[PDB]
Ligand binder design. Structure first.
Ligand SMILES: OC[C@H]1O[C@@H](O[C@H]2[C@H](O)[C@@H](O)[C@H](O[C@H]3O[C@H](CO)[C@H](O)[C@H](O)[C@H]3O)O[C@@H]2CO)[C@H](O)[C@@H](O)[C@H]1O
Ligand SMILES: [Ca+2]
Length: 642
């Protein structure tokens, strides 16, 4: 039983073998980059899908279609693949898809009788000791996987040969394996609804990454961060309940021959479940005059700053004067330790604030800890939607067992029902959720700029920035929360909770608004700092967060990336580099034939010594244009062409 499937361009092919085990491999341009890798699902009735599998039928199709992708990187995304469905006896199938830039598969339940998934095998067997770039689970102890399942999915990348990885620490997704000769494999998953998230492990075999899933929770207890978390204390002997026919999540091996194709791949959105929303007209992407990063630390005002009405009114004024759409009331507005979103601290009047914000063309987003939000979800959403609140930022889930991934979707739907937008923090990679419910405008699961509030200088944020466009961002949008006006060149960074800075240059921060995808996007710094920086603020306030077209012009993972994005007849280009100074050329052949005006923010000539140093230039340009830009260490540039 040997089945082959090829990508439309013929460069990628997978061979599926049906024997004692069910396996698939991956060949790229003749070279085998994944050796036969076994897949299976073990059920509680002893049935193991994929061992001694009995094929009952097959079907093939060739698909080339455009998938609408609102509130994202393009108006629509191309879905172009050869598909193979293997139908087995006992009412289960496995679907394979071959794209030019990846192989993906998923199990499908067509059984009528409820059951449980005990474990799932999803192995990745490589032919040699390749170099992996992986994000380890940050918390917990080695070998104690239950201590690791409780984590916030925020960490930097460790780069090591497969044989050199920690064999006792889980890695979350996405992660990358360097297959050599410029080929990258990026492993991720999508359509992660009501199913535990997949970790990979180096614990089994040679040159092999194998799966592990958090077990279904048997007993959860309120605790953790300010009594807003539900901690798994006991777990079942299975990982998932299955009560109905369903698709299971896609297992995705992105395969690219150039790093810019990795950053650009659409596979995560393409393989998310289709939108479940008819009316999208009420969803408004945009930016936030954020309170939390900058620690409410305004200067030049006549009131004491903090979680109080005059402070939020100042953020609202600032947002409004600059056309910024939203103000978040972050953690602090609800009475601490009560986990009760109906108990407002005495220094705050939500009604006053929501109404004041409304009279200033500003929407209010309320922050909520997981348990406070989940416990009376529908009533909370109704009550605040009625008050005029536009959405929620929900955080500290720190779980990806089945119960929590079911909660993400349930939360998204409940917010959708009441015309509320949703931002998920203390969560994992998006894995398709923003396609299925487009009102979920951002996701954390990223070691973002908040880390500068407490991180030792050993944390290399500049390096991290040129890793995630190729790794974490492959899964979906990031709430990274950039926009620092305080910028520290190499050696000048220190963690400062109430007056934080970024690592690298001013223009790096500006470039991130193009480089990073964030439909719901922060201005992390104080209004005070922004108002001392008119030029920077104007650029940030004006740039779209949602795009009609996106092109990654060039890049090398962990070194640099240059990205151009279109909105109407306006283009933006952003570039960033690692700690090496770098010279970049921008080929402007993506432009139309009209004559255009460019506005360029580039690193100042002393940006290597003073991170804040920038230069803003104006000049005419057109399609033949080939703009040379110098990037300082930890620097970048931001370009607008109108
Ligand atoms: O990681 C070690 C440091 O953690 C700090 O605690 C942070 C935590 O790291 C962070 O993920 C979390 O961020 C969420 O909540 C915030 C409000 O509380 C914001 O909403 C933020 O956007 C959201 O991602 O905040 C924690 C603090 O609340 C510790 O402060 C630090 O000492 C280190 O232990
Ligand atoms: Ca966080």
């Amino acid at each position: 039983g040997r089945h082959m499937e090829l990508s439309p361009d013929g460069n990628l092919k997978t061979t599926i073998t049906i024997g004692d085990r069910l396996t698939y491999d991956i060949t790229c341009n003749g070279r085998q980059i994944l050796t036969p890798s076994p897949i299976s699902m073990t059920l509680d009735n002893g049935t193991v899908w994929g061992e001694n599998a009995k094929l009952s039928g097959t079907s093939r199709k060739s698909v080339d279609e455009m998938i609408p992708s609102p509130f994202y990187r393009a108006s629509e995304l191309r879905n172009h693949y050869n598909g193979l469905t293997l139908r087995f006896k006992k009412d289960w199938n496995v679907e394979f898809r071959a794209y030019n830039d990846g192989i993906a598969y998923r199990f499908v339940n067509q059984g009528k009788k409820p059951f449980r998934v005990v474990t799932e095998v999803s192995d990745y067997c490589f032919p040699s000791d390749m170099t992996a770039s992986v994000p380890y689970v940050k918390s917990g102890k080695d070998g104690d996987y239950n201590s690791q399942f409780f984590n916030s999915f925020e960490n930097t990348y460790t780069t090591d040969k497969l044989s050199k990885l920690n064999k006792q620490r889980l890695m979350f997704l996405p992660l990358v394996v360097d297959a050599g000769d410029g080929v990258k494999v990026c492993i991720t998953e999508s359509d992660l609804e009501n199913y535990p998230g997949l970790y990979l492990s180096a614990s089994e075999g040679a040159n092999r990454l194998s799966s592990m899933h958090a077990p279904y929770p048997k007993r959860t207890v309120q605790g953790g961060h300010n009594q807003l978390q539900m901690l798994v204390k006991e777990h079942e002997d299975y990982i998932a309940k299955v009560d109905k026919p369903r698709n299971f999540p896609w297992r995705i091996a992105v395969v690219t021959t150039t790093d810019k194709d990795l950053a650009a791949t659409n596979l995560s959105y393409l393989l998310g479940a289709p939108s479940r929303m008819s009316d999208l007209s009420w969803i408004k992407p945009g930016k936030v005059a954020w309170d939390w990063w900058n620690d409410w630390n305004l200067d030049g005002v006549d009131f004491v700053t903090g979680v109080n009405n005059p402070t939020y009114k100042a953020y609202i004024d600032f947002a409004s004067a600059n056309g910024i759409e939203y103000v978040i009331l972050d953690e602090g507005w609800a009475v601490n330790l009560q986990a009760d979103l109906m108990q407002v601290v005495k220094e705050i009047d939500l009604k006053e604030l929501v109404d004041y914000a409304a009279s200033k063309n500003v929407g209010i987003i309320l922050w909520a800890g997981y348990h406070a939000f989940e416990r009376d979800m529908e009533n909370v959403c109704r009550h605040y939607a009625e008050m005029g609140v536009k959405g929620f930022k929900v955080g500290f889930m720190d779980r990806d067992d089945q119960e929590m991934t079911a909660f993400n979707y349930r939360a998204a739907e409940m917010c959708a029902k009441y015309k509320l937008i949703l931002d998920l923090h203390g969560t994992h990679k998006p894995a398709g959720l923003n396609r299925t419910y487009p009102n979920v405008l951002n996701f954390e699961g990223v070691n973002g700029l908040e880390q500068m509030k407490w991180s030792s200088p050993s944390v290399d944020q500049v390096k991290y920035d040129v890793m995630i466009p190729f790794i974490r961002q492959v899964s979906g949008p990031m709430d990274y929360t950039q926009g620092a006006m305080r910028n520290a060149s190499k050696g000048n960074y220190y963690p400062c909770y109430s007056e934080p800075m970024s690592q690298g240059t001013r223009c790096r921060q500006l470039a991130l608004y193009v480089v990073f995808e964030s439909p719901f996007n922060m201005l992390c710094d104080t209004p005070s700092n922004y108002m001392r920086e008119p030029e920077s603020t104007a650029f940030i306030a004006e740039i779209p967060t949602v795009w009609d077209e996106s092109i990654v012009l060039d890049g090398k993972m962990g070194e640099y990336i240059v990205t151009a994005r279109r909105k109407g007849d306006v283009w933006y280009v952003g570039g960033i580099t690692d700690w090496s100074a770098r010279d970049i050329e921008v080929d402007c052949s993506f432009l139309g034939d009209k004559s255009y005006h460019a506005t360029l923010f580039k690193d100042g000539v002393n940006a290597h010594r003073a991170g804040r140093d920038y230069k803003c230039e104006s000049f005419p340009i057109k399609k033949d244009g080939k703009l040379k830009v110098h990037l300082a260490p930890g620097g970048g540039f931001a370009l607008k062409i109108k």
